[PDB]
């Protein structure tokens, strides 16, 4: 197991995690926008 | 200071930052859930 194999697997872990963190952010942005609409409606 | 030392230190910075961004997300998810409960309670 080379340094390059370790670097590659770290990069892969990071990219997978970034996609999951973005999806979580989008879910929460929808929830917050729904709350803002509830508190802002006439 | 090699290219590999730079790559390693960048990867390390990124992984530390990802753990901190996740912790911030969890704190905010708790705060948003508390707001949702306040606005949803009977």
């Amino acid at each position, epitope marked *: *197991l080379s340094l390059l*194999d*370790k*670097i590659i*697997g*770290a990069v*892969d*872990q990071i990219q*997978l*995690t970034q996609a*999951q963190l973005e999806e979580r952010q989008a879910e929460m942005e929808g929830a917050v926008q729904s709350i803002q609409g509830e508190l802002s409606k006439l | 200071l090699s290219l590999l030392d730079k790559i*390693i230190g960048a*990867v*390390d910075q990124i*992984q*530390l930052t*990802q*753990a*901190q961004l*996740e*912790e911030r997300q*969890a704190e905010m*998810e*708790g705060a948003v859930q508390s707001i949702q409960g306040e606005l949803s309670k009977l």
Partner: nanobody
Amino acid sequence: QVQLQESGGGLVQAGGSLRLSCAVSGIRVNVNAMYWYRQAPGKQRELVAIITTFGSTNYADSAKGRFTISRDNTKNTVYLQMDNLKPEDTAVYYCNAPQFTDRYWGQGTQVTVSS
């Protein structure tokens, strides 16, 4: 699949020490950053400690210098040494890799600290 087998929890007195272990299969701990989490009853999962691929560490503020994360590459095992334990550390402790926290959690290991 990835297998996560946590052990080393139990019942400990305040001021005591534990060393948790997570035996990992399906990914290499010397390739992947690895995290320890804890979850107290009815509370949100809290990140406790992280070790990066190249061995840098970070801790939650609740650890405040008491916890040390480490690994054994040959045993493909991640460890969390916990010193000067407090009742507030009572929780189930879990090890994971960040890319799988949306996917699978092991059974965890129960840590109970009593005064």
